[PDB]
């Protein structure tokens, strides 16, 4: 009569756990051209039916900013970047001093001194010869040596550049749990970055995510499903970045109006080096456009959400960045295979109280130091022709000014440029657990006597 | 938001007295001490545990927003100003005497 404990198998059990995520891309479509920087020459194709089911009667805890899937992305992406970087030509011959002048070609007068024409006696295919060559450069990539100039990073780890054929366009990537593990997702459209979720589902793989890189506003992320969302690991800690997620796209147009031309030289055998060609036509600044009305109305929507965390009728203000490294001082992104920076402070020139387009100046620097790293540097190759870019702005990374009094007149600025929080905007929806099929329970049966 | 207050003023307590100081605040609390001409020193952090190298005599308590700090067996070398702190706001210092 007394119950005996007995064995069961295939029983669902969940434990929080971490494993390396599977690589995936849709149908390996990148394979049609060679080749994407992150898809590499190969990845696993996605399942034709990435099915998910809503679990009956289930809720689950989630912890944004605790999930290490994000951290895996941080180092996987970096590793990929270096993986394609490694088979390329070093540019250290270019540390030789260059003569320069402020060359113009019907330059607008707000572009003056932004470009320099410079030259050096290089190296040649034979060690015994030298030749003089010149190219255009952005002022940002040089510094006067003491006019004579040197590349800005010659007092830092070496600059490299080759293999322009690789594509820097993002491609969505999906991740899949190892067998015996599973991906769980929160289905609540309004979910807070942490705590239990009233509705859950599970899926074979994550939704695809592009490897988007930006430093002030999120670009081309998932839309908030119903309303603009604001999240922080702890809103009272102002060292924390404030997530802002739009529930609608905001169109932005960006261009590099100058026709671009290119030339190349040989540093030595096997050592092609791309360099800017002389530019034909009027010289004009890079710029972007966003609707005045859309920016205003959606900003007010952010404010309406923002008020949820503060006393009623609190004064709210936005502001120009407090400065720092250029990567956060200005908005930056890569489009068209070329880096851009812009002055976004005009977008924040507002205040808020109770109760047709904007244009922004931009800049280009071809010497880049990725992320926060200082051990590497690279030269972007010139991009021929006029650059045209169109994208949807999907959110903001914001910070809040410290101090003040009486819980009032809060203010905000762009900030948070660490790439980890771009990824968090997509991955907060997911957690991964370990499946333990084994389990036991009491029974009225006994093994047969033999 | 920040609700910090403190009541210790200053204390005249004699040597060897166990003594306490209290304050109240919304959120996490850190305790510190300082002497003139010197940088402040952490004593308690995260509403609980002593900073490493703090003497065993030091202790404290948390309940609700309440916070307590005490020193068992107080000695003249322990005379200092004291603080309660939250990420930015700091209660004005209070101090031992004898």
């Amino acid at each position, epitope marked *: 009569e007394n119950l005996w404990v007995t064995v069961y198998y295939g029983v669902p059990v969940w434990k929080d756990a971490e494993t390396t995520l599977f690589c995936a891309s849709d149908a390996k479509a990148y394979e049609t051209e060679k080749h994407n920087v992150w898809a590499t020459h190969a990845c696993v194709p996605t399942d034709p039916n990435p099915q998910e089911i809503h679990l009956e009667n289930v809720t689950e805890e989630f912890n944004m900013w605790k999930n290490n899937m994000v951290e895996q992305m941080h180092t996987d992406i970096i590793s990929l970047w270096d993986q394609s970087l490694k088979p390329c030509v070093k540019l250290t011959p270019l540390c030789v001093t260059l003569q320069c002048t402020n060359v113009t070609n019907n330059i607008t007068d707000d572009m003056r001194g932004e470009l320099k024409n410079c030259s050096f006696n290089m190296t040649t295919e034979l060690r015994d010869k030298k030749q003089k060559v010149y190219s255009l450069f952005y002022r940002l990539d040089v510094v006067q040596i003491n006019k004579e100039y040197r590349l800005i990073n010659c007092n830092t780890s070496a600059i490299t550049q080759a293999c322009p054929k690789v594509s820097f366009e993002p491609i969505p990537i999906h991740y899949c749990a190892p067998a015996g593990f599973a991906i769980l997702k929160c289905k609540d459209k309004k979910f807070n970055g942490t705590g239990p979720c009233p509705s859950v589902s599970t899926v074979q793989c994550t939704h695809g995510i592009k490897p988007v890189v930006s430093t002030q506003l999120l670009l081309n992320g998932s839309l908030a499903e119903e309303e603009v969302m604001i999240r922080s690991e702890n809103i009272t800690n102002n*060292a924390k970045n404030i997530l802002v997620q739009f529930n609608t796209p905001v169109q932005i147009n960006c261009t590099r109006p100058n026709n671009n031309t290119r030339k190349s030289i040989r540093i030595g055998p096997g050592q092609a080096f791309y360099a800017t060609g002389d530019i034909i036509g009027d010289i004009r600044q890079a710029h972007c456009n966003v609707s005045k009305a859309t920016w205003n109305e959606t900003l007010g929507k952010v404010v309406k959400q923002l008020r949820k965390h503060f006393g009623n009728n609190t004064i709210i203000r936005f502001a120009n960045s*407090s*400065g720092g490294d250029l990567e956060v001082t200005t908005h930056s992104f890569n489009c068209g295979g070329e880096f851009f920076y812009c002055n976004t402070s005009g977008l924040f020139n507002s205040t808020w109280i109770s109760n047709d387009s904007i244009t922004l100046p931009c800049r280009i620097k071809q010497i880049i130091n990725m992320w926060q790293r200082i051990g590497q540097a690279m030269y972007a190759p010139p991009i021929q022709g006029v650059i045209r870019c169109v994208s949807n702005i999907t959110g903001l990374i914001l910070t809040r000014d410290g*101090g003040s009094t009486n819980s009032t007149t809060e203010t905000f600025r762009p900030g948070g440029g660490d790439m980890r929080d771009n990824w968090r905007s997509e991955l907060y929806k997911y957690k991964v657990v370990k499946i333990e099929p084994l389990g036991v329970a009491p029974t009225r049966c006994k093994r047969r006597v033999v | 938001d920040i609700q910090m207050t403190q009541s210790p003023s200053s204390l005249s307590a004699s040597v060897g007295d166990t003594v306490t100081i209290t304050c109240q605040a919304n959120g996490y609390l*850190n305790w510190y001490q300082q002497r003139r001409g010197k940088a402040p020193k952490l004593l308690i952090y995260d509403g609980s545990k002593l900073e490493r190298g703090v003497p065993s005599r030091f202790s404290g308590r948390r309940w609700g927003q309440e916070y307590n700090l005490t020193i068992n067996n107080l000695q003249p070398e322990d005379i200092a100003t004291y603080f309660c702190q939250v990420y930015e706001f700091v209660v004005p210092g209070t101090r031992l005497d004898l």
Partner: nanobody
Amino acid sequence: QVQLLQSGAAVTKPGASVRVSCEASGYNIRDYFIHWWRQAPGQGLQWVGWINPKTGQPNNPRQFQGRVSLTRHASWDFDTYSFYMDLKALRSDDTAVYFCARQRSDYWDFDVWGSGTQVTV
């Protein structure tokens, strides 16, 4: 040596710009926020701001806007860092001890400070 270096005391006539500084120590600087504090004599300590050394990014109270900034610098071999606080508008009530601090934790534990310096006007 984990301890921060601290720059010496100074005095200027009012309205002067002023600079103070601190330096790196054996802990990895990249992993912690730098904070500045000031104290008027006869008064409790006041927070000034913080800077994220990895990004060079300052945060200050509305009270000090447009008056101060924080900067940082590092050795080309990255074994040192410098930190600075600049104020462009001294006034007699700006006399204070000024010092650096490290944010050890997300509870803002500050287990180290520079000795501080005395700025006077």
